[PDB]
Amino acid sequence: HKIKGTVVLMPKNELEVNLNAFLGRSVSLQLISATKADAHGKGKVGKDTFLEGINTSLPTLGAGESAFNIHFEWDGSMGIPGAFYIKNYMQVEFFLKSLTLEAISNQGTIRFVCNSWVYNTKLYKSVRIFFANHTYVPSETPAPLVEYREEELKSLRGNGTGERKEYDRIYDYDVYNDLGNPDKSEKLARPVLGGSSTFPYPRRGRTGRGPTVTDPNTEKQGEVFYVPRDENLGHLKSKDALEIGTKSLSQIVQPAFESAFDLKSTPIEFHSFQDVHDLYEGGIKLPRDVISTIIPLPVIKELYRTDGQHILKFPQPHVVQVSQSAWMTDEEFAREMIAGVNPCVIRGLEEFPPKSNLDPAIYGDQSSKITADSLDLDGYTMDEALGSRRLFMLDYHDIFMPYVRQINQLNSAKTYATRTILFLREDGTLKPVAIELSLPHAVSQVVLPAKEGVESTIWLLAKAYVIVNDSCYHQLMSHWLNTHAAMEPFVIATHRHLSVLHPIYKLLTPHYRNNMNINALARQSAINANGIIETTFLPSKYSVEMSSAVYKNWVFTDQALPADLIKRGVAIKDPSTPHGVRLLIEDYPYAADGLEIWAAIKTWVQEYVPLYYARDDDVKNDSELQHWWKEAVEKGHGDLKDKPWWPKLQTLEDLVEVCLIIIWIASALHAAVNFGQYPYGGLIMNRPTASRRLLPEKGTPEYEEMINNHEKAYLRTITSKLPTLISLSVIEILSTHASDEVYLGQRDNPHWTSDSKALQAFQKFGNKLKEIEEKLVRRNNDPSLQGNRLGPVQLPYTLLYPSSEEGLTFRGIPNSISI
């Protein structure tokens, strides 16, 4: 009557940044029957059973893993197991991977996929339970397991109170009231984001540290920002703990840099473009103290080459590897709006001039001052250019104008609100033809392209002001708001309301990996008062607040790629085409490749969903799914809960489109806007983060400097040297793939379900991605597409290749928002 099992676990030390202790009575497992119930309808529980011996002759073991044999005594009254309890009596937690049971049931083997930290049993209010890898919608749960299933969800929700501890597995919501630190200084006070019409915002994971003394609305600071324990990913190699790098950069490296500048040991400013290129050629000389702080730190020490004493050297950014000056071309400036770090803002223009929606009673006349007759449209008239759908724009006027006055009152910030007009040439590339620089009470200056004279320098500076607008929008809205922040409410709701058993849990959760973790470190170090963003980007203390203003207009159903392209007027609906949209910029790289990835994900979801839902009524009647979606909208994105565009989740089609959008955001959208940051932005001149002065007026020294030394004029206008060093370091981290990444088309365990049809559908998805990759390779070797896919910088657009090796690769689509 003995069942042979094998436990697989990793001791804590293998995942941090003696095996015989596990034997004896150190760790007990108890089996739980799925087929035989006690008087109260609950699956019968087996006796405490302890680990018996170390299994060294197991071939499939991975790095840092160890397998223990175990033998349960399980007689005929006990039925067939479908779960188990585990109790750790050791003082130290360990990471459990799996339990395998041999020669039991009509399937011969029973597998339990666990992947969880198991802390001392005294620390938990209820015993840890794990389920076999059989998928069940709620109405199909074996009756003896129904109460276990519901109780485990109750456990994951908690009661909405208390300070969360490192071993809690409690998923709940709170507002972004943790970024300000008013108890340290009223200068570090920040508005609460979320829970009001003034500052709407997605919710984040609740931590419960308690209010500050100066502001009962704001959460007290802490040394560790809690995430539910299994979201706090360990790593076999310390260099893969990229998420901790931003914390070390803020707390340790930044102060060290500042000390070297306060000491005036290095020059405070760049003086020529060569001073910037030196950062990746010969490097920068720093004091020994500052070098000796860097080289021992995990993650940080990988970001730089050093001799260990004085010289620090950054890697050469892709954007310059082929040509050092090509970034300055009008061609590259336009091309990066469809193939760069932020490819998803450019709009079609259907009327001219562009109009503002700003209330004139406050902002006065905001209508564009660009005149059609001033534009060189390669011989076209405006009527023809509009009629052929060749006129586009990048328009940061209405978004920035409400903030320009506040920003320009800062000591070292000056910005314009910008509009850029772009013309689609007959060779299929974009030509910038005007930039409008606006200030509030509006004052507008139109700047036209010029290659000679002082006017050419003014045009170069005008482009820098545009890219400062675009860099702040990319980081805070395209990247931080649309991916990281928008996703976290769905992570929370999934764990609160979908069992580990649920088919949609298994479909979705791989795409949540590390999301909560990186976000919690980001709230602590990246978007906090006086943190990395506020110090390196233009809007300073207004940065995160601006993203709340944009969230007012966020529409979940406009995050689907075809809907986004139509809403921005860069595509039209066309049922004759393979994807149902025709691109008005034919070669648009981000969009063309993205549509291929979108379609592959759609095929996967539309195949998986019908395996578990036959008809619309099956979706309606899934109580876990209905509670999941209700809470995700009404709590997680609760400030938008009354908008009419939320899907209702009443149909197979509804469920499909919800899962498809979530997977798209977490994988390919995030990848496209994240992994190009250092490749394009590692040259600060190409992607400035801040501007520090307005255009010089005629007759001043600054204007004469502009005539005689355009490089100095440029560098005086953009990000200063010290914030440049900090910013380059952060985007190098963010642009790096860890070696334990899980990419789109892959999963961390081959046994996540017993359902062979689901596994076959998943294999088909992976094979499709490989086929797509070969298609994208061919696109990048097609000479007729080199204008937009490579450009003057000769950089092939690989950000939507699905696969990648580790490192700073400018390719690869992770499953999730993992960095």
Question: Which residues of this protein are in contact with Fe ion, per CB under 5 A?
Answer: 674
Query: Is the CB of 66 or the CB of 514 nearer to Fe ion?
Result: 514
- Per the annotation, the verdict on 479 as an active-site residue is yes
Query: Is the CB of 438 or the CB of 475 nearer to Fe ion?
Result: 475
88 is in an annotated binding site: no
Catalytic residue from among 235, 318, 484, 511: 484
Min. distance of Cβ 237 from Fe ion in angstroms?
A: 20
Please, what is the end-to-end C-alpha distance for the chain in angstroms? 49
Question: Cα dist. 554→257, 451, 477 in Å?
Answer: 38, 39, 10
- Per the annotation, the verdict on 484 as an active-site residue is yes
- Per the annotation, the verdict on 674 as an active-site residue is yes
Min. distance of Cβ 669 from Fe ion in angstroms?
A: 11
Query: Is the CB of 678 or the CB of 714 nearer to Fe ion?
Result: 678
Tokens at 681, concatenated? 């932005």
Phi-psi region for residue 41, left (φ > 0), alpha (ψ -120 to 50) or beta?
left
Dihedral over Cα of 40, 44, 49, 54: its sign: negative
What would the 3-class secondary structure string for 272-324 be?
CHHHHHCCCCCCEECCHHHHHHHCCCCCHHHCCEECCCCEEECCCCHHHHCCC
Q: Evaluate the omega torsion of the peptide bond into residue 144 and state whether it is cis, within 30 degrees of 0.
A: no
Query: Is the CB of 112 or the CB of 743 nearer to Fe ion?
Result: 743
Min. distance of Cβ 475 from Fe ion in angstroms?
A: 10
Q: Could you give the count of Cα atoms lying within 13 Å of 309 in the half-sphere of its Cβ?
A: 1
Q: Is 735 exposed, middle or buried (0-12, 13-18, 19+ CB in 10 A)?
A: buried
Rounded distance between C-alpha atoms, residue 52 and residue 27, angstroms = 10
Catalytic residue from among 133, 469, 514, 674: 674
Catalytic residue from among 495, 497, 637, 670: 670
Tokens at 679, concatenated? 């490749």
What is the number of the residue whose Cβ is closest to Fe ion?
674
277 is in an annotated binding site: no
DSSP E strand stretches across 596-743: none
DSSP E strand stretches across 469-608: 571-573, 581-583
Rounded distance between C-alpha atoms, residue 770 and residue 548, angstroms = 38
Query: Is the CB of 22 or the CB of 801 nearer to Fe ion?
Result: 801
Min. distance of Cβ 518 from Fe ion in angstroms?
A: 7
- Where do we find the tokens 């607008």? 469
Query: Is the CB of 88 or the CB of 809 nearer to Fe ion?
Result: 809
Q: Is 2 exposed, middle or buried (0-12, 13-18, 19+ CB in 10 A)?
A: exposed
- Per the annotation, the verdict on 670 as an active-site residue is yes
Computed over its alpha carbons, how large is the radius of gyration of the chain? 28
Catalytic residue from among 110, 346, 504, 819: 819
Catalytic residue from among 318, 397, 479, 737: 479
530 is in an annotated binding site: no
Min. distance of Cβ 683 from Fe ion in angstroms?
A: 20
Min. distance of Cβ 365 from Fe ion in angstroms?
A: 39
Specify whether the CB–CB gap between 454 and 706 falls below 8 A.
yes
Rounded distance between C-alpha atoms, residue 18 and residue 551, angstroms = 51
Query: Is the CB of 177 or the CB of 674 nearer to Fe ion?
Result: 674
Min. distance of Cβ 229 from Fe ion in angstroms?
A: 22
Rounded distance between C-alpha atoms, residue 449 and residue 298, angstroms = 47
Tokens at 141, concatenated? 């749960």
819 is in an annotated binding site: yes
484 is in an annotated binding site: yes
Bind-site residues: 479, 484, 670, 674, 819
Question: Catalytic residues, which ones?
Answer: 479, 484, 670, 674, 819
Q: Which residues are annotated as a binding site for Fe cation?
A: 479, 484, 670, 674, 819
